[PDB]
Amino acid sequence: MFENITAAPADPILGLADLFRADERPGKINLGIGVYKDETGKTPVLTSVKKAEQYLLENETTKNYLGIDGIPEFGRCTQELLFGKGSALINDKRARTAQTPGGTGALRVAADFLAKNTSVKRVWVSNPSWPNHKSVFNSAGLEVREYAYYDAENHTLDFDALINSLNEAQAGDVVLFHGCCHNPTGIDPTLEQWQTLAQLSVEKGWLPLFDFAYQGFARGLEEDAEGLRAFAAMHKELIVASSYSKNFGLYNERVGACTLVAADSETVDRAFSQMKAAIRANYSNPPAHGASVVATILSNDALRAIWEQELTDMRQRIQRMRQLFVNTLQEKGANRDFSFIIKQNGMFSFSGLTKEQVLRLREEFGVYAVASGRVNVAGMTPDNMAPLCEAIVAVL
Amino acid sequence: MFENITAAPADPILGLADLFRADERPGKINLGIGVYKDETGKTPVLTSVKKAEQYLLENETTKNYLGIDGIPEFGRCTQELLFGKGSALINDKRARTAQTPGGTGALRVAADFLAKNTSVKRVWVSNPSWPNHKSVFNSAGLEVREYAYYDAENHTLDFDALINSLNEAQAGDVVLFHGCCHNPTGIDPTLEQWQTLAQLSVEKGWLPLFDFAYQGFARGLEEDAEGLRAFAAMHKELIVASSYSKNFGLYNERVGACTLVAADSETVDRAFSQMKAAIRANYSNPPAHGASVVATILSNDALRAIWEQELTDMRQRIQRMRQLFVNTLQEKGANRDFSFIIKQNGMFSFSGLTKEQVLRLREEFGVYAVASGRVNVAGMTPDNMAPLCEAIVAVL
Numbered sequence: 130m131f132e133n134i135t136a137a138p139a140d141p142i143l144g145l146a147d148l149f150r151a152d153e154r155p156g157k158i159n160l161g162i163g164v165y166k167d168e169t170g171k172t173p174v175l176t177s178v179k180k181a182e183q184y185l186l187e188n189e190t191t192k193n194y195l196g197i198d199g200i201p202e203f204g205r206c207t208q209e210l211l212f213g214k215g216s217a218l219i220n221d222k223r224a225r226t227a228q229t230p231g232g233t234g235a236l237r238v239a240a241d242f243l244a245k246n247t248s249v250k251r252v253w254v255s256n257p258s259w260p261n262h263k264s265v266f267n268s269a270g271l272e273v274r275e276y277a278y279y280d281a282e283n284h285t286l287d288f289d290a291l292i293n294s295l296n297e298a299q300a301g302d303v304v305l306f307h308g309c310c311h312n313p314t315g316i317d318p319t320l321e322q323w324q325t326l327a328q329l330s331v332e333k334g335w336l337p338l339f340d341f342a343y344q345g346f347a348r349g350l351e352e353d354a355e356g357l358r359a360f361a362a363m364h365k366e367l368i369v370a371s372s373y374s375k376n377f378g379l380y381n382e383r384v385g386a387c388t389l390v391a392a393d394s395e396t397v398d399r400a401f402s403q404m405k406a407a408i409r410a411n412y413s414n415p416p417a418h419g420a421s422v423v424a425t426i427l428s429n430d431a432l433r434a435i436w437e438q439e440l441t442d443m444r445q446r447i448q449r450m451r452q453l454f455v456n457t458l459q460e461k462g463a464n465r466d467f468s469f470i471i472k473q474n475g476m477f478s479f480s481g482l483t484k485e486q487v488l489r490l491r492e493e494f495g496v497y498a499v500a501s502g503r504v505n506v507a508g509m510t511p512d513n514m515a516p517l518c519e520a521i522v523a524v525l
Numbered sequence: 526m527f528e529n530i531t532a533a534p535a536d537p538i539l540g541l542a543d544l545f546r547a548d549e550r551p552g553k554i555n556l557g558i559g560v561y562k563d564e565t566g567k568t569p570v571l572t573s574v575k576k577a578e579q580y581l582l583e584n585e586t587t588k589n590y591l592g593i594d595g596i597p598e599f600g601r602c603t604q605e606l607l608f609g610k611g612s613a614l615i616n617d618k619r620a621r622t623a624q625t626p627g628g629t630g631a632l633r634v635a636a637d638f639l640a641k642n643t644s645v646k647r648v649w650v651s652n653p654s655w656p657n658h659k660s661v662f663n664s665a666g667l668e669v670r671e672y673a674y675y676d677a678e679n680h681t682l683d684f685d686a687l688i689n690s691l692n693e694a695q696a697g698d699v700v701l702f703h704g705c706c707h708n709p710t711g712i713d714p715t716l717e718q719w720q721t722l723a724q725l726s727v728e729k730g731w732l733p734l735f736d737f738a739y740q741g742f743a744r745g746l747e748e749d750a751e752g753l754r755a756f757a758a759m760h761k762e763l764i765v766a767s768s769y770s771k772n773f774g775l776y777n778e779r780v781g782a783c784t785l786v787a788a789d790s791e792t793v794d795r796a797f798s799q800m801k802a803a804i805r806a807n808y809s810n811p812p813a814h815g816a817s818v819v820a821t822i823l824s825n826d827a828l829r830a831i832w833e834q835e836l837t838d839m840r841q842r843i844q845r846m847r848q849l850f851v852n853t854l855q856e857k858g859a860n861r862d863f864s865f866i867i868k869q870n871g872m873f874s875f876s877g878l879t880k881e882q883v884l885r886l887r888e889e890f891g892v893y894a895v896a897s898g899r900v901n902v903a904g905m906t907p908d909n910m911a912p913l914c915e916a917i918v919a920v921l
């Protein structure tokens with residue numbers, strides 16, 4: 130059966146982690162995967178989630194199966210985080226959310242749903258985008274086409290080319306938007322550019338799929354959800370795939386949500402029974418621990434307060450690391466002006482490094498960046514900033 | 526987009542849980558889903574897993590992403606539990622296991638793998654089988670055909686009809702076997718019947734997919750893995766989907782494994798990179814907590830000892846509940862002889878109840894059984910045994 134199965138290519142993000150760790154050069158720098166690191170090079174489990182975990186350890190009586198859609202508490206808090214407390218879609222009972230294994234699991238459940246219950250043949254995804262978007266949507270059967278997005282010379286969002294790109298998208302096509310902290314560019318629409326796109330998918334008939342992995346990392350939790358809320362005020366139907374792996378530092382527990390919105394509660398609940406039938410045919414019901422923790426933290430005035438401060442410290446430490454990196458690069462001999470990365474949002478810096486600058490950096494300096502030139506700024510600390518900038522300016 | 530989406534039918538196992546709980550009749554009995562209950566009507570979280578959880582709470586430093594295939598420790602213990610310590614496939618490095626969200630997630634990953642990397646068009650599944658088998662394999666693209674299995678008059682495995690059924694299976698087809706505690710019948714092959722099937726899939730060219738949800742519940746952990754080990758000694762390629770939701774009482778954390786075996790380590794690792802590419806395109810990497818606990822318990826001499834006793838108490842309490850149920854039924858006026866359910870293995874009793882005996886029992890006595898007449902014996906306690914038997918004999 131398995132004799133002529135070819136070996137798959139390694140994952141462009143995760144394949145790095147395999148190589149990094151097998152390397153026994155002592156001064157290597159990771160900058161690959163997109164996990165926060167603190168000033169000391171470590172990804173601690175947050176304190177708000179250690180208190181919540183002690184709590185579940187004292188207060189759980191059963192591990193008996195969650196419903197197909199998970200913890201209801203988790204569901205309404207996620208909807209409030211996305212749409213706002215007292216939003217009109219919450220009140221009209223227009224949204225239905227399923228707890229999922231991370232944002233990837235929410236993105237696939239969406240894809241599986243749409244493939245067997247919808248007309249959609251095409252998902253539109255930005256150029257550039259998360260590398261695994263294409264792989265999740267092709268596995269469901271859907272075709273992935275690309276729209277323009279980043280102007281590389283000017284280091285801006287190329288809004289016009291994004292508009293003219295999408296004029297080849299039909300009514301009935303999915304268009305994926307990153308909510309904030311665009312992965313990989315970190316370049317996001319202004320509010321004014323999002324209400325322009327809000328209005329345009331309304332007369333073009335696109336179904337919006339918002340991907341939210343980094344809410345809380347660009348300006349703040351509410352500030353980051355504005356673009357989606359500009360679409361939500363206008364659209365009868367949306368879907369958002371949300372992840373709490375980054376903002377909760379809960380990466381390996383796999384906590385996310387696929388939230389469905391239709392024109393009214395009857396349609397949304399009818400559509401939701403199919404989405405739940407897709408979830409059953411894949412894994413059965415979602416992993417409890419991680420979602421259990423999000424919901425304990427968001428249900429507690431005190432424990433929520435502590436998380437929101439932990440998330441603000443991260444937002445700020447990455448911002449500090451950005452200015453540091455453009456300053457250090459400067460005085461380390463930097464051949465170009467890298468000041469544009471200051472204006473980018475989130476964990477990443479989309480540097481202009483070529484695939485070979487990036488290959489040379491791993492294979493002789495041991496600093497790991499994705500082959501697109503995406504480097505994780507949250508993986509930089511004041512101790513490794515100098516090694517790292519000396520490596521980039523010797524490859525320039 | 527979602528206007529003419531029809532509502533899905535409710536799940537035959539999980540849809541029960543929705544109805545049970547919405548019912549506010551005080552004496553209702555659940556008997557539906559296949560979760561263990563102790564003498565007091567409760568599914569406690571085991572003590573071996575509460576000690577292991579205290580431990581992770583004291584000893585974890587990060588929630589940073591697991592590899593696509595999860596915890597390696599989890600992987601080798603699962604292989605040892607399935608194949609035996611010092612098995613030849615472990616030593617020849619012939620097996621590769623990925624940690625998954627429960628046994629359902631392992632069964633889908635298998636299906637996704639085989640669909641894009643194999644010739645297989647057909648998975649053969651028993652009649653009767655777990656209701657969701659068909660749904661997981663059809664979602665991957667595969668067709669599901671059925672083979673004969675249970676003789677309902679005699680209450681036996683109908684081995685001949687199982688043989689003649691499968692003579693319509695081609696070389697290259699998947700045939701799914703339940704390892705032990707057949708869901709729904711609880712009727713399993715003898716060892717002699719399994720080495721006969723072991724030999725027959727070898728000259729017929731079937732790929733064996735073993736489903737293991739209840740290892741430790743029929744005779745014991747090693748005793749229960751004998752059939753699979755009879756196939757493993759003969760086959761160059763197998764796949765087993767394993768779950769630790771039942772034997773670890775870890776239902777909602779979602780801990781299982783998809784373990785791949787090929788003729789040699791090169792092929793198995795080549796095939797495994799594709800299986801890992803399927804896992805990435807669905808959820809990304811597995812939920813850590815539940816697998817983390819299995820591996821702490823199995824890595825500890827003491828904590829393992831405590832689990833194995835907890836699993837023996839369950840095995841025994843269900844056996845006690847079986848004799849009780851056939852005894853009580855007898856003296857409650859039982860119209861037929863139900864002594865055959867004594868000879869069945871696992872949590873379930875495949876009673877001969879018709880869909881209408883089963884509908885009448887929920888809708889007027891409030892005892893919930895699956896529409897196949899599958900009743901969960903682990904949901905019976907000495908306090909609810911009499912209500913329950915009075916209900917069955919009034920519907921007979």
Ligand SMILES: *Cc1c(COP(=O)(O)O)c[n+]([O-])c(C)c1O
Nearest residue numbers: 231232233259312340342372374
């Ligand atoms: C991190 C990330 C994901 C994956 O989320 P998780 O499954 O790890 O939670 C998905 N998408 O799409 C983007 C853009 C991410 O940055």
Ligand SMILES: *Cc1c(COP(=O)(O)O)c[n+]([O-])c(C)c1O
Nearest residue numbers: 627628629655708736738768770
């Ligand atoms: C319980 C059970 C499953 C599902 O396993 P989990 O995902 O809940 O662990 C799958 N199969 O196939 C059978 C027979 C089961 O009894």
